[PDB]
């Protein structure tokens, strides 16, 4: 008869207990005290405008029907006991497909203190929404929210409130990051109220602030577009009698920019506007488009269809074009001036 | 307390296998939808994902309680011990009630017997899309709400508040589409077993055009124009006027091959296949133009316009920028 004492305590707490009734249903509100330990702020999917987060979602409230007097001041109980006790119906207001883990047992802990103050944590994998404003893509930033509250119990029944000065009640584990593309700069904790069709609800809010590292798109998009415009500007330095060769510059670099302008918007939501990367490609497409219209003008004024033999001085040969002597300077300059206005408009904000 | 005895009086001998007024009048289940979001509208799978707060009001005289002035908002697990209607969705491919941190249900008993049964349902409803005008088309996506086991002799549906039933449509900002209007239709349908009530929430998804210009149209214009450089190059440059048209029929192929990867296998000609086959002709005729020139000067040489070699180029510098501008004027006024 060793463990019969704690069995007698647990059976006494569940005799007149009804797990369908809020503590103080016609008496007072139920102040639920929350806490979040973000273990790993998982990978942000741009194509779905979502993100993944792995939290230890803590809760705490006072149930006066669970007072006891025993050898211990706190009952570190099993997760089965939580299904027989009223737990608040907290859902996430922007969750898409969130998982309450149960490997190998349901990952819940219930700790009944001697005066009724409960503690109830869960290990969740919330796949939440994040409305993105991809106008400054990829040099932009987002404030992805994580918003939770009660589903059935209104403002006059269950009131959520953060513990211990809310700005430090959502802590992020330093080990788990899981952000390959973005960069977590810090969180902002707030609290609000909805006006649904059924009543006012108390809504907690944690905005995680992100910042996309642009190191990927420089390698994959910006440098193949810059090195293509330079290849279109190689053709100004050839002679004008090499029409079957300066054509190959001005057309294949259009085929290169066509390949880049199609495969740049992969893994993106098909938005109804031009991103900041689209304002780079469509201008770099215009330095390659105009590098062939330039050669169509030089070919239009070429009289003699034969190159300089070498053993002569200016038979009559074609002089070096006055359009080429200008466009060897203007096209590398006007591309470099645009390449300063572009990276100063967007890297300053 | 007093409430714990009152709820047990409501659920003592409460038979959940029996409809309210099981031998009498039909029960009037009034519905109410608060749409959270529309996640993804996919043309490849011909469906759309809808997340909503789905609510139902009916009254049940077995759940009437007196004395307590409050609306008894119970735990969600009592909904497994009550009668709830077996309403389903015909368009439903794959749906689930959200179960974090609990299964998101609600039971709000009212002291006259009125029952609120709210759900947070993420359903993947189906739309067969008419892509003949793609990507310049409107759509019509519905959500066919219907009872399964109760005919119109047993149950009746109605939207609550009339047109103010479905809310949260104006909050929806789809990146691809744009919601024009939504309608609320209440009717009855007849199967081989009986007449069932049916509600339907329809939409009008008008597609935005700003993506497909920068993706498909505006490249295909500026590549059709670069087939016109050959009319300014002299006809002696055989390796140059060929390398224009040969690279340009490759480039119109790569636009076509990198488009069918993200698009279903529909048999009919879309409005974007009519355009990319349309711009393929102006590219292909600009290369047949050179072989028409190269045959006259070198094959017909030794032995509209005349058969002069310079005259055909000076003719083609005017006609093809005029015909292709005429092609876009017919195209962007027939579909827009």
């Amino acid at each position, epitope marked *: 008869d060793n463990t019969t004492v704690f069995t007698r305590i647990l059976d006494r707490l569940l005799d007149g207990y009804d797990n369908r009734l809020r503590p103080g249903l016609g008496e007072r509100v139920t102040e639920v005290k929350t806490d979040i330990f973000v273990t790993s702020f998982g990978p942000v999917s741009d194509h779905d405008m979502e993100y993944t987060i792995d939290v230890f979602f803590r809760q705490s409230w006072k149930d006066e029907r669970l007072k006891f007097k025993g050898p211990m001041t706190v009952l570190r109980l099993n997760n089965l006991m939580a299904s027989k006790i009223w737990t608040p119906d907290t859902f996430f*207001h922007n969750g898409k497909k969130s998982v309450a883990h149960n490997m190998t047992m349901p990952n819940k802990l219930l700790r009944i203190t001697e005066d009724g103050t409960l503690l109830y944590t869960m290990r969740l994998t919330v796949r939440a929404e994040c409305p993105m404003h991809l106008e400054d893509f990829p040099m932009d930033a987002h*404030a992805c*929210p994580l918003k939770f509250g009660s589903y059935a119990y209104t403002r006059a029944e269950v009131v959520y409130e953060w513990t211990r000065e809310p700005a430090r009640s959502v802590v992020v584990a330093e080990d788990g990051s899981r952000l390959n593309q973005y960069d977590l700069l810090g969180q*902002t904790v707030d609290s*609000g109220i909805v006006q649904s069709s059924t009543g006012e609800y108390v809504v907690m809010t944690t*905005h995680f602030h992100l910042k996309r590292k642009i190191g990927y798109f420089v390698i994959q998009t910006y440098l193949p577009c810059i090195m293509t415009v330079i290849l279109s500007q190689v053709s100004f330095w050839l002679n004008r009698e090499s029409v079957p060769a300066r054509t190959v510059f001005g057309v294949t670099t259009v085929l290169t920019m066509t390949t880049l302008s199609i495969s740049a918007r992969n893994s993106l939501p098909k938005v109804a506007y031009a991103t900041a990367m689209d304002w780079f490609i469509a201008v770099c497409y215009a330095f390659v488009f105009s590098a062939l219209i330039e050669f169509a003008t030089v070919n239009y004024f070429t009289k003699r269809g034969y190159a300089w033999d070498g053993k002569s001085v200016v038979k009559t040969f074609n002089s070096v074009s006055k359009i080429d002597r200008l466009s060897r300077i203007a096209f590398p300059l006007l591309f470099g001036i645009f390449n300063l206005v572009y990276w100063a408009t967007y890297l300053n904000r | 307390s007093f409430v714990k005895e009152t709820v047990d009086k409501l659920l003592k001998g409460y038979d959940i296998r029996l409809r309210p007024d099981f031998g009498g009048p039909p029960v009037c289940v009034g519905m109410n939808i608060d749409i959270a979001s529309i996640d993804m509208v996919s043309e490849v799978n011909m469906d759309y994902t809808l997340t909503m707060y789905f609510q139902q009001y009916w009254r049940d005289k077995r759940l009437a309680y007196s004395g307590i002035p409050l609306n008894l908002t119970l735990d969600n697990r009592v909904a497994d011990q009550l009668w709830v209607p077996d309403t389903y969705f015909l368009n439903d491919k794959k749906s689930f009630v959200h179960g974090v941190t609990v299964k998101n249900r609600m039971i709000r008993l009212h002291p006259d017997g009125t029952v609120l049964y709210g759900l947070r349902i993420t359903t993947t409803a189906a739309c067969m899309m008419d892509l003949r005008r793609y990507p310049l088309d409107e759509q019509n996506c519905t959500l066919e709400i219907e009872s399964y086991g109760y005919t119109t002799d047993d149950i009746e549906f109605y939207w609550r508040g009339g047109d103010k039933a479905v809310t949260g449509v104006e*909050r929806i900002e789809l990146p691809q589409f744009s919601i024009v209007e939504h309608r609320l239709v209440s009717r009855n349908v007849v199967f081989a077993t009986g007449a069932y009530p049916r509600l339907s929430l329809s939409f009008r998804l008008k597609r935005n055009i700003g993506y497909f210009i920068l993706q498909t149209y505006m490249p295909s214009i500026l590549i059709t124009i670069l087939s016109w450089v050959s009319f300014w190059i002299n006809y002696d440059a055989s390796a140059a006027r060929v390398a224009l048209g040969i690279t340009t029929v490759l480039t119109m192929t790569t636009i076509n091959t990198h488009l069918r990867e993200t698009l279903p296998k529909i048999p009919y000609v879309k409005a974007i296949d009519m355009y990319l086959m349309g711009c393929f002709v102006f590219v292909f005729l600009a290369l047949l133009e050179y072989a028409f020139v190269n045959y006259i000067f070198f094959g017909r040489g030794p032995q509209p316009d005349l058969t002069d070699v310079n005259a055909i180029d000076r003719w083609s510098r005017i006609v093809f920028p005029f015909t292709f501008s005429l092609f876009n004027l017919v195209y962007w006024l027939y579909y827009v």
Partner: nanobody
Amino acid sequence: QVQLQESGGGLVQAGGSLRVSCAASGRTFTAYIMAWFRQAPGKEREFLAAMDQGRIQYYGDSVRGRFTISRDYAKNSVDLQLDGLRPEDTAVYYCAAGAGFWGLRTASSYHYWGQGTQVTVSS
């Protein structure tokens, strides 16, 4: 260009309600956070109210329970039900809109701003 045109009222009796509105044009703000602010003479911009996309009302701690923000997602606007106007609320009310990066309380996160509305509470 995006114009956040405002309306509302200038003068009110101390103990009288008021309704200050803010229509928008040039951009659909159905995905942004449209907020209100307050700038007393000789004092910085003070946060009053904000509503997110999901109809979530974020109030200031000094003004909670008095004011009531309400958006109209169809007409692309935002409203602020002034109620219980003490004489310490005489300032210029601004209408903001932004994504709230390091924000929702910080005034430096709102990219689009209104003109201002002088609200005078007389006792």
